[model samples]
Target: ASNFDCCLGYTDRILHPKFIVGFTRQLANEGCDINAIIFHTKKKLSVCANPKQTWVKYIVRLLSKKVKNM
Candidate 1:
């Protein structure tokens, strides 16, 4: 359960779920969604996302447009 326990070993204050959510919000403002950006690929099974990644930018824009439409 990597997701369940992966947050361990950081400062307890910062590892809390509420803190994580706040951090994610900040990251999103800087053009990165932690949930969407952190994922494993095949073969090498690597996790990656850049602040300037094209797909991330596209999805963020799409989500923003959807929110506006709503």
Candidate 2:
């Protein structure tokens, strides 16, 4: 039951399909459990990672930091 939530902020920007696909693909290629990623859209993009997937938790934290910087 390990999970973390990340906010993408309230920008009019919507995640492009290609970006999402490419990002997920990269994670998969890096040996991460891609299925552990869930996206929720609202004022921001919410990235949820399954705690059972250790790689996913790390990736989630990494992406969250990247998004915050952008």
Candidate 3:
């Protein structure tokens, strides 16, 4: 939890659903500079995306539901 792994930057590419396995939300008020959605991929990689985007929000909700049930 101490890693922080803050999102100082972000990406705009529409990440596919199959590639997304898990996620974390990084808020601007929480030491992070921007409000970004951090997505962990099936390949074990983390990506930062703009949370204000429509597609990004969709994935966030999707991952949230799946993780809650698990």
Candidate 4:
């Protein structure tokens, strides 16, 4: 089976009311915070936090939904 992986600004997308609530539900069922998943991954990849701007947001936005409904 395929999988969904979201990061960074993708937060607004993957964390949308629809996806966020559902994702968080799953995490909650597993006794975890969906937000922590996002935070931890980003914390580990600090370089991405200060990445060059311009197309970076665009790229992430484009890629954010790539695996949706997978």
TM-score to true structure, per model: 0.29, 0.27, 0.75, 0.23
Tens digit per residue, CA lDDT, model 4, 11-70: 222222222211111122344223123312332331222123434344445445557665
Please identify model 2 stretches exceeding 4 Å from their true place. 1-49, 67-70
**If ranked by TM-score, best first, what sequence of candidates would result?**
3, 1, 2, 4
Summarize candidate 3's per-residue lDDT along 1-70 as a digit string, tens digits: 3336477778878886879877888876766655778888888988887887888888887777776555
Cα RMSD to the true fold for all candidates: 13.3, 11.8, 3.1, 12.6
**Reference-based lDDT, each prediction:** 0.31, 0.40, 0.78, 0.30
Residue pairs in steric clash, candidate 2? 2-51
Question: Could you give me the TM-score of model 1 versus the true structure?
Answer: 0.29
Displacement of the residue 51 alpha carbon in candidate 1, Å: 1.7
Stretches of candidate 4 exceeding 4 Å from the true structure: 1-52, 67-70
Model 1, stretches more than 4 Å misplaced?
Answer: 1-25, 28-48, 67-70
Clashing pairs in 4: none
lDDT of 3 at 53: 84
What tens-digit string does per-residue lDDT give for candidate 1 at 25-61?
1243344333233323333332333434565455444
The list of candidate 3 runs beyond 4 A from truth reads 1-5, 67-70
True-vs-predicted CA distance for residue 10, candidate 3, Å: 0.7
